Amino acid sequence: AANPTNCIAPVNGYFIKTNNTRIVDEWSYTGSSFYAPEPITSLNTKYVA
Amino acid sequence: KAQSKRSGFCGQGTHIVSFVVNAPNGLYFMHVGYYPSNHIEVVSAYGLCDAANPTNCIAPVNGYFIKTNNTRIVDEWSYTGSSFYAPEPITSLNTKYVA
Amino acid sequence: WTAGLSSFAAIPFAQSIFYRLNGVGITQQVLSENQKLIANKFNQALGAM
Numbered sequence A: 001a002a003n004p005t006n007c008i009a010p011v012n013g014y015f016i017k018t019n020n021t022r023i024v025d026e027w028s029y030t031g032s033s034f035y036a037p038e039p040i041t042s043l044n045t046k047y048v049a
Numbered sequence B: 001k002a003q004s005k006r007s008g009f010c011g012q013g014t015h016i017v018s019f020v021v022n023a024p025n026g027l028y029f030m031h032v033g034y035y036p037s038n039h040i041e042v043v044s045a046y047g048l049c050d051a052a053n054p055t056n057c058i059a060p061v062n063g064y065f066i067k068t069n070n071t072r073i074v075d076e077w078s079y080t081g082s083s084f085y086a087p088e089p090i091t092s093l094n095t096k097y098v099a
Numbered sequence C: 001w002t003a004g005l006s007s008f009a010a011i012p013f014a015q016s017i018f019y020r021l022n023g024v025g026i027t028q029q030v031l032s033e034n035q036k037l038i039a040n041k042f043n044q045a046l047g048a049m
Helices: C013-024 C029-034 C038-048
Strands: B014-021 B028-034
Antiparallel strands (some): B014 B028
16 A cells, blocks of 8 residues: 555565565575565555556 | 577578478478668667666667656557566766766 | 676766775875875886886
8 A cells, every 4th residue: 555565576476475485496585574665556556457 | 499689590680480391301380580671770778877776777778768657668558657667776976867 | 897888978087096096995085185296207107117
């Protein structure tokens, strides 16, 4: 709802609970840190989908 | 594997998609390439200086066509930059502009 | 920076050399200003060739 939105920049992706992805092969390498401004919102709002 | 970060060979100028075709006694390569087909001259604005400590400078494209905030460098439209398009680097000394 | 096509057109040759030097090496535009007769040294290198 706020202007920053979940986005895919590196491996990213993931599902519920915002970002739950690891750039490294080992799982949970990153807790969910990243944030950053979102440039635009795509169609099918509430989701970049 | 990757259209981006590739030396020109897949297609003249921009290359969008790459495909593999089985030629007789060999391998045939089919590639999708983008050619502008038209050129229109517009004045760029190499970045801008703002009261915010990080100035807005357009890293991806040379400059902004109008109002020091424009993004019509592509096929169509006259969309104005909202500053999301231009990344904000550390300010560099220049005359009322990132230059 | 010709990332895609020739849409970027042209930029001043002297300025382009300074920007490319800044990207290639830690030498910076402020350091280049501190350096004296950098262009003359480049001319000497062309003369040596």
